[PDB]
Amino acid sequence: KETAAAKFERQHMDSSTSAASSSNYCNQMMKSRNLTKDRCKPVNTFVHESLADVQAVCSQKNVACKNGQTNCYQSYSTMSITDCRETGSSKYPNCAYKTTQANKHIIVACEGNPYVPVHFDASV
Ligand SMILES: [Cl-]
Ligand SMILES: [Cl-]
Ligand SMILES: [Cl-]
Ligand code: NA
């Protein structure tokens, strides 16, 4: 049974590459992180920074989350990210994703002790 912090790591951290350099990155990563197991997760962002750098966002700019909560934090700097989105022709179990690489500020919700990211809210 997965902790919220561990779920964030599994869904959103990819420190092993500096960027998505292939159109098939999302198809491979959504599968290997078990985000296509019982259904195709429609949208998911991977962050290509160290875990420490992403955890540090919880001490950066405090902003509102989309849902009105006030435990969201926006990174001061831009980060390398890859947005993965199901294509219109995708449907389980043959999940298919579009890969879009970008450099953007990330916004995460943080909780707990230690105070760490538990939800990916958006990128700007
Ligand atoms: Cl898993
Ligand atoms: Cl996401
Ligand atoms: Cl402020
Ligand atoms: Na947790």
Side-chain angles (χ1 to χ4, degrees):
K1 166 56 175 212
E2 206 172 23
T3 68
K7 182 176 188 162
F8 178 95
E9 296 166 344
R10 174 174 63 85
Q11 294 190 316
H12 300 298
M13 293 301 311
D14 182 15
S15 314
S16 73
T17 62
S18 60
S21 67
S22 154
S23 60
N24 291 306
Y25 172 90
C26 286
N27 290 333
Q28 285 173 313
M29 284 292 296
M30 295 296 284
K31 170 169 157 158
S32 60
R33 297 301 179 86
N34 294 329
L35 306 180
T36 66
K37 201 188 153 283
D38 291 309
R39 70 190 237 301
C40 311
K41 192 183 181 206
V43 173
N44 189 67
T45 301
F46 289 101
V47 184
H48 306 285
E49 303 294 342
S50 72
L51 183 58
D53 279 359
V54 173
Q55 290 170 336
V57 174
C58 295
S59 302
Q60 294 180 16
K61 186 67 168 195
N62 183 219
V63 295
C65 312
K66 286 182 118 309
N67 69 1
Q69 302 182 240
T70 64
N71 64 320
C72 276
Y73 293 83
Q74 184 162 318
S75 59
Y76 292 146
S77 71
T78 61
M79 293 183 173
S80 174
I81 67 98
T82 304
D83 196 42
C84 298
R85 290 214 174 215
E86 264 192 298
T87 62
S89 76
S90 170
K91 72 179 243 272
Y92 183 85
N94 296 288
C95 306
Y97 292 88
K98 178 182 165 55
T99 297
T100 306
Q101 172 69 33
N103 287 96
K104 300 187 297 195
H105 302 88
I106 66 168
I107 296 140
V108 293
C110 304
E111 287 181 17
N113 214 264
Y115 199 60
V116 295
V118 293
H119 159 81
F120 194 93
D121 205 59
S123 59
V124 172

